Write a protein that binds this DNA or RNA. Structure first.
Lengths: 322, 322, 322, 322
DNA sequence: CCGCATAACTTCGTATAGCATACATTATACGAAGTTATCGCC
DNA sequence: GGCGATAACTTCGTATAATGTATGCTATACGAAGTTATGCGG
DNA sequence: CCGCATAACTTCGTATAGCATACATTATACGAAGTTATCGCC
DNA sequence: GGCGATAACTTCGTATAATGTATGCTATACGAAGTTATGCGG
């Protein structure tokens, strides 16, 4: 019917309305689905539920994780719903098979992993080693780690701080205005403070790098092999490069990583969120202050962060050890 | 369709259902929508989503703020709903457009602005600079600034104070009765007391102006070129004239505005509410005792006025600094 | 047509799902509407929108409060909705006339009233006066006032306490299990705790009256002219009687009621709820604790209580006047 | 209809989508419903609102709790949903009678119960009494009580522990790996640690029995009439036998159980979780640590276990008892 | 033995306030164009 | 004796920040007409 | 003076976490039949 | 050297307390293969 292609044309015409990341994986899963359908001589676009059942079981037999299969189903649902057709997931066969896979894989022992923490005694050790550095690169790296630990920002947000957003309170402390986030979108935005410690690091960076020459410059820039910094107003330092600061620092402290082929063997971009949330909850701050520090809306999100507190030093052990 | 004719007759029959400030805006929107439709040969009254798309993109290209565009769409919704026709915002296209617009403009870095504060040190300065004038206009202005800062009333509420509404308690403080409340549940209360210091200024005005000859007189009035007051029971100073008091007082101490054309280069009708709130929050006053004084009910705006005070640095700064 | 008869028969057959106050008010509204329709020779049940427009304009000319007219419309809406017919309020002709009446009456200065507060100093004064009375009537009244001030319950819930509901902590405080409330209804529920002093008053009353020797008696009961209690398990004090206790206690201190015929000239059953809330607000208790103590769901209700406070002692005068 | 036959066949094809505990209840509910429909001579499968109403009122006359009645309605709604029919809960009359039953039965004084708490004093007493014993069946029971109290694990997940899940730290404490988690995101984490004292018990049990001779053996097993232990790897000790340990040890101190026929007259499987919760609350451990320790995501349950402690008395008690 | 009359509550009706959740009006900011009641020269 | 100049304010239109009202039920406020037990002087 | 090297960062492709709102499935409690490995009394 | 009496559990059914998953979208993790400016043999 024409209305399907009309709706698809409308969805593509305002492609900017979705995230940059949401389009990438719609296409990625569409490749795999169409390839499997062709290999088995089945019509690929208007999916038939008894074929989707076979596809899901085939994905299970390959050994993919449950959240991968959740993604693979979720995009086909999105595509049909936005086309204006009934979802595949409305039929009982796929609805029950998804539960069956979840049950059997969880009973076999699969679980969700979590990033390796980065706690205050690590920040103190890194700072103790790096404080004497006169390299521009070390100044940049230490200032970044300071902002990351203090604000609990995402890496994607730290990549886009304009110089014009840096402002000062009545005293010495710095204030950063963040604007939109992964959830908030408004011109009122959120504003966050920095301690009398890390502002010396940020102000040293700004003074040495000279990014202050134009209010449209970004704070963070490429530093080349020569050691010169290349200020810019039109290109952002990639998140793929920001992860390398964490990896290089962990290698500096503990030496080289092994080839085991498992995730989270070293610090990664999420490590500072976890470590700050653990340090703050262990110190006994109240739930409302934790919520205001992190900016979450639902209190149970806190229980997703503090999951892996060290049982060998928790409340009951101290209580029974008298 | 004569049913629309009926619905319109039954709408403007009860036109007093809406503020005159609403009617002022609805016609200003319709003039622009009709002019654009005329220029582009579109049919103007029953809006088509493929027209509303193009019009919203034209407003974006003209550079209006996001909330101006939301105002423009809101009035078109109101006109359709009261006409009985399907609400244009319900269409799939225009919601995708609005999402694209706001996400683009927020990525361009638009930020909300806020009134310049008028603070205790300024009230002390203007007082010690002006209180010796015999010129009646100076007495009138110095009394107005005192009532404004002491009561946090909005200027449209201050313009309506009858001299009938003043009373004088046994301790000598003036009590101002609130004639017309803003809301059926008057969250601000019903009566406000002036300081002893301000009372002397208001008594100076009442004695000089002769306005106490009749209870129905308005407390504030125009002063002619001759330097003589003109009491009235039937007319009020325009709020436009009251804004001139703030402008002239700022111009008296500082220079003049830049040619930059930006808003909030000088004190304005909300400068007192902001400044008083910041003074209260800098002292020890509790959040609900602040919130009750100004008549707010949402936390958000009270936070938005105090966010940059060094009381509000939060739990992480407290942990880091000790 | 006659399916309406089935719908109404179902609504009547299960009517115990609704509070009896909701039926009592509905029948009075129907008597009013039917009497007016009979006076003007109109058909009464299916509410033609222009008829209810005439009826609302007739009510406004009697000078009834805005809340009364809202109630009169709200019951006719509910009667149509539950019958399975289009609401009369769905017409623009009715909702605009309501919006007009609301906005016009506020220009005449109408506002919602509030009960007279009963604060801590009054409680201490009454205890100082009555503590030594040997009349069991005084022991009862002083226990009732102590509970009502401590626990912030509605008097309709204080009338409902069984002797089964009373327990003690190991510290000797008393706990009252509330169960049902005006908004929360479950077999688990709220439990509230008295201070030591109020427990001494309650135990004094229990010991004197003997009500506690059978667990299913109610805690409060009538006392005859002779000064002897009459325990019961099947009847309880009217709320009218509990209001009489407040009014008599006010007349004990201030001697006589004014002849002016205004409402809220003396303490009434709501007086204690308002007073404790004000005492908490002046004490600087945080919003989450005030919310927990009152049991309210949403922060706006806090602002709905502290509407009235003494401006002549308020923060702004206290700050400006040193 | 063939659609029903196919939907039922699909529901049977994937039967592992639900726990066996869901199937058991669905069958008991269907037997009850079909028996009642047979006795009253009505068609039973395509259930009708009048029949569900009559059945619900029949269940109320047996005096079943309101949560049992809601369970009975729930399973019939599941059966209808998965059969692909409209469901009784969406109907009008069922929604009214569920209100009627709830409100009437709450006003009748129906009350929710809790487990009898097994607190630190009881564990110290039982240990001081039993620990001298040398017969294997006593050592088993004391080791089980120690693990249950220290870990807060539930009895079912305690039965699953294979001996290869035990491991030892260089601190001499014993760690238990959870194995199968309850949920994909394990709020309780992944590993539990025993205190030294409980480890001294477990080492005795694991050395007196032969269980350690194969890493696949279950940690607990039958002990026969002559004290011979019967280690196994295919079969695990039934939960019913685990409840017997709590009941028998209670009976050993407090004698014969009362005849009143109520629940919770003696300790049961939850007595340890409630006891350890209250023991932590007395020590002032903050709510986030208690919630992470026991794995609760909803604060309401932790609150319902600690209301009775006077530490939870509200701010009005602090204001009165200043 | 008696009739009476004061306490201390109960029942009834017409007015008015409270709650929790879901989504649209209502006011101020600024530049430009018009008043019309007094300073001034000549 | 006027014509002219000019303070101090009023009215208009487009741009942007702030605060509100509708639903669907639950309560309380007041006074007037009633009811059932004892105290008192016969 | 030219060519070759190598720090330091971009694109690209499959794989797994995080969120905020809305609505049911999963486990323990406890009578009471039923099983089987042994003592007990000849 | 045979029969029956006892633990010490196991399986079953119905009644009541407690914790869970689905949806729609946004982000991070990691290996691999380009890019492009400086360093420096000779």
């Amino acid at each position: 019917s024409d209305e399907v292609r009309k709706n698809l044309m409308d969805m593509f015409r305002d492609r900017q309305a979705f995230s940059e990341h949401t389009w990438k994986m719609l296409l990625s899963v569409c490749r795999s689905w169409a390839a499997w359908c062709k290999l088995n001589n089945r019509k690929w676009f208007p999916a038939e539920p008894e074929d989707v059942r076979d596809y899901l079981l085939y994905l299970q037999a390959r050994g993919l994780a449950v959240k991968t299969i959740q993604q693979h189903l979720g995009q086909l649902n999105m595509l049909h719903r936005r086309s204006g057709l009934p979802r595949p997931s409305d039929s009982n066969a796929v609805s029950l098979v998804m539960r069956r896979i979840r049950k059997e894989n969880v009973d076999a022992g699969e679980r969700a992993k979590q990033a390796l923490a980065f706690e205050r005694t690590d920040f103190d050790q890194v700072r103790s080693l790096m404080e004497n550095s006169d390299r521009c690169q070390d100044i940049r790296n230490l200032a970044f780690l300071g902002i990351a630990y203090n604000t609990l920002l995402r890496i994607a947000e730290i990549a886009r701080i304009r110089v014009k957003d840096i402002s000062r309170t009545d005293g010495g402390r710095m204030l950063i205005h963040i604007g939109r986030t992964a959830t908030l979108v408004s011109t009122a935005g959120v504003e966050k403070a920095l301690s009398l410690g890390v502002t010396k690091l940020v102000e040293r960076w700004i003074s040495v790098s000279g990014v202050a020459d134009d209010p449209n410059n970004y704070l963070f820039c490429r530093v080349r092999k020569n050691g010169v910094a290349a200020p810019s107003a039109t290109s952002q330092l990639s998140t793929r490069a920001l992860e390398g600061i964490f990896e290089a620092t962990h290698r500096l402290i503990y030496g080289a990583k092994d080839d085991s082929g498992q995730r989270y063997l070293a610090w990664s971009g999420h490590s500072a969120r976890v470590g700050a949330a653990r340090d703050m909850a262990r110190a006994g701050v109240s739930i409302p202050e934790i919520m205001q520090a992190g900016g979450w809306t639902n209190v149970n999100i806190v229980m997703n962060y503090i999951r892996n507190l060290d049982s060998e030093t928790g409340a009951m052990v101290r209580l029974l050890e008298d």
